[PDB]
Paper text:
To verify whether molecules larger than azide could be coordinated to the MaPgb* haem-Fe(III) atom, imidazole binding was tested on the crystalline protein. The structure of the MaPgb*(III)-imidazole complex was solved at 1.38 Å resolution (one MaPgb* molecule in the asymmetric unit) and refined to final R-factor of 15.9% and R-free of 19.8%. The structure of MaPgb*(III)-imidazole is well superimposable in its backbone to that of the MaPgb*(III)-cyanide complex (rms deviation values calculated for 190 Cα atom pairs ranging between 0.41 Å and 0.45 Å, depending on the superimposed subunits), and their dimeric quaternary structure are identical. The azimuthal orientation of the haem-Fe(III)-bound imidazole is staggered relative to the haem pyrrole nitrogen atoms (lying at about 15° from a line connecting the methinic CHA-CHC atoms), with a haem-Fe(III) coordination bond of 1.97 Å. The haem-Fe(III)-bound imidazole was refined in a double conformation (occupancy of 0.5 each) with the imidazole N3 atom pointing alternatively towards the Tyr(B10)61 OH group (2.69 Å distance), and the Nε1 atom of Trp(B9)60 (2.64 Å distance). Additional stabilizing interactions are provided by several van der Waals contacts involving the hydrophobic MaPgb*(III) haem distal site residues, such as Val(B13)64, Phe(CD1)74, Val(E7)89, Phe(E11)93, and Phe(G7)145, surrounding the haem-Fe(III)-bound imidazole. Overall, the haem distal site structure of the MaPgb*(III)-imidazole complex superimposes well with that of MaPgb*(III)-cyanide. Small differences occur in the position of the Tyr(61)B10 OH group (a shift of 0.75 Å), and the rotation of the Phe(93)E11 side chain around the Cβ-Cγ bond (of ∼13°). Thus, the ligand sensing mechanism of the Phe(93)E11 is preserved and the Trp(B9)60 side chain is properly oriented in the haem distal site cavity to stabilize the haem-Fe(III)-bound imidazole and to shut tunnel 1.
Residue numbers in the entry:
A (entry chain A), B (entry chain A): 5 to 195
Write the structure that this text describes.
């Protein structure tokens, strides 16, 4: 159904476990309250996903040095690559809100890190593109990912107090994930 | 005056330049509007720094796996290390708000990265402590650094609209810096 999407079936145990996740949740101040509100964020965002994708890919597409990461060697955007990734990105919005953050979730977080990194970039879709996404931009993107989501959370007729709690949960969850995705980028033993 | 604080006098040119910084600012959505409001954040936070430090170090100190990074080999917090770092952290609050983000600023961002990493950790204060701060926690800390600051920004009798703009500027600036600090942690050529 979603080409290349292998959540829960990588058959590869990540190099981090639930104890690692507990300590990382503590560092990012994520608790059971955020679990509640991230789920509620999923209810709000579910039927706005197409517009979210348009916004997100609009941001990427308007910056040549960002759109770069989806380009063919000739410098033009690879439209097959963009379309296939867009489907998996859309699903990630739902996963972030709806999935339990358990070992299967960690195993896919390792996978997503590997796919941004040179280790696995451009293999899932069998495309020819740039070899690596510089780690600096994964961290930077914590901000726009959070900023893209804010207006959409405010839209579904929920209380502003609930909106703030959903937004903070989303900020924490995005930060948590990017922290895990540093694994293949970071010198062994420094993560 | 501040022991170990060597901003603007490292005499070492960072491996990133103003073009790198321009592209990273674009990725984190930082503009001249944020320059304005981060400066205004500095006016607000200046006379609350002691309370900010208490909050921040309170968070670190209440989590044994975080306080770990300041511990002597015997597992007890090194109080000399805590005190010396606290002075440089306090100054960093002001620097973030007040400094122009120019080459000198980049050169100190490289330095701060090096000091969290095993490359330079525990050398500035000539202490014996744990060798490295795992990069996962630098990313994670983007959230509490931003969450610690929010209440203080809301305190100095400014409009809530200005408060929101100061807070967003602070979020962007913190993310920007952590992205740069990945440099010594990231495999060469993957940053
Ligand atoms: C907060 C930061 C980021 C988030 C949340 C994010 C999210 C995602 C997701 C969910 C996927 C699909 C994962 C899967 O295969 O199931 C993906 C892949 C991809 N992302 Fe990101 N991403 C981030 C940073 C970046 C940056 C900075 C770029 C640069 C434009 C980028 C470009 C791409 C590309 C090119 C792929 C395809 C990688 C491949 O060949 O498999 N991502 N991203
Ligand atoms: C957003 C993330 C972080 C920020 C903004 C931050 C800020 C700072 C600053 C401003 C300094 C002093 C720099 C200087 O020497 O002038 C410092 C040093 C230090 N920080 Fe962080 N820090 C972050 C992440 C962390 C984490 C996750 C830990 C773990 C507890 C930590 C523990 C320390 C320690 C132990 C030092 C002393 C390093 C040395 O030996 O030189 N920091 N930090």
């Amino acid at each position: 159904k979603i080409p290349g999407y292998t959540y829960g079936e990588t058959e590869n145990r990540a190099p981090f476990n639930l104890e690692d996740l507990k300590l990382l949740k503590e560092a990012v101040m994520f608790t059971a309250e955020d679990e509640e509100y991230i789920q509620k964020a999923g209810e709000v965002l579910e039927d706005q996903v197409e517009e979210i994708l348009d916004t997100w890919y609009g941001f990427v597409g308007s910056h040549p040095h960002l759109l770069y990461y989806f380009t063919s060697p000739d410098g033009t955007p690879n439209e097959k690559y963009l379309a296939a990734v867009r489907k998996r990105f859309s699903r990630w919005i739902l996963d972030t809100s709806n999935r339990s953050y358990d070992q299967a979730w960690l195993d896919y977080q390792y996978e997503i890190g590997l796919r941004h990194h040179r280790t696995k970039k451009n293999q899932t879709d069998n495309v020819e593109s740039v070899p690596n996404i510089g780690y600096r931009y994964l961290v930077a993107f914590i901000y726009p990912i959070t900023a893209t989501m804010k207006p959409f959370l405010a839209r579904k007729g929920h209380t502003p107090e609930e909106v703030e709690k959903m937004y903070q949960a989303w900020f924490k969850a995005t930060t948590l994930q990017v922290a895990l995705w540093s694994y293949p980028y970071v010198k062994y033993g420094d993560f």
